[PDB]
Amino acid sequence: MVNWAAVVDDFYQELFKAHPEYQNKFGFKGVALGSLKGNAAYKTQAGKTVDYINAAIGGSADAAGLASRHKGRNVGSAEFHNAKACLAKACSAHGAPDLGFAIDDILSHL
Numbered sequence: 001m002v003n004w005a006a007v008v009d010d011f012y013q014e015l016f017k018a019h020p021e022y023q024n025k026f027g028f029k030g031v032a033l034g035s036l037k038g039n040a041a042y043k044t045q046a047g048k049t050v051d052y053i054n055a056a057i058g059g060s061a062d063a064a065g066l067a068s069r070h071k072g073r074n075v076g077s078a079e080f081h082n083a084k085a086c087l088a089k090a091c092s093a094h095g096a097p098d099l100g101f102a103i104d105d106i107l108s109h110l
């Protein structure tokens with residue numbers, strides 16, 4: 001099966017490398033990027049991200065609800081466009097399909 005967990009790990013490496021300040025909104029704020037896999041807050045967040053991807057592909061994802069939740073953290077369209085780029089890189093590095101369609105669905109509610 002597609003190793004979405006590995007894709008997600010690379011995604012966060014790309015995301016926080018390009019936009020380190022985004023990491024301050026998370027429970028693993030301040031943690032060195034190279035050590036995130038050993039952080040409990042990160043493990044939970046990564047798991048939820050993997051789940052969301054599998055839900056988008058599976059057809060059960062609630063893109064409107066995820067979009068609203070992000071707005072509730074002052075995360076909007078600009079951040080998701082940046083994320084779209086980081087995720088494309090991560091997908092490509094693992095021979096996984098691009099997930100732009102899934103991010104676009106979230107964007108349609110931002």
Ligand code: HEM
Nearest residue numbers: 022025026027048049052069073075079080083084087103
């Ligand atoms: C590919 C793009 C993204 C995906 C698939 C994604 C997915 C998710 C998911 C599934 C959750 C859990 C929501 C829940 O528990 O109901 C979450 C939470 C969150 N996301 Fe994202 N997200 C993305 C982009 C971003 C970006 C660019 C930021 C910028 C800061 C961000 C900030 C947050 C924050 C602060 C939380 C809450 C963390 C917490 O509860 O400790 N997200 N995201």
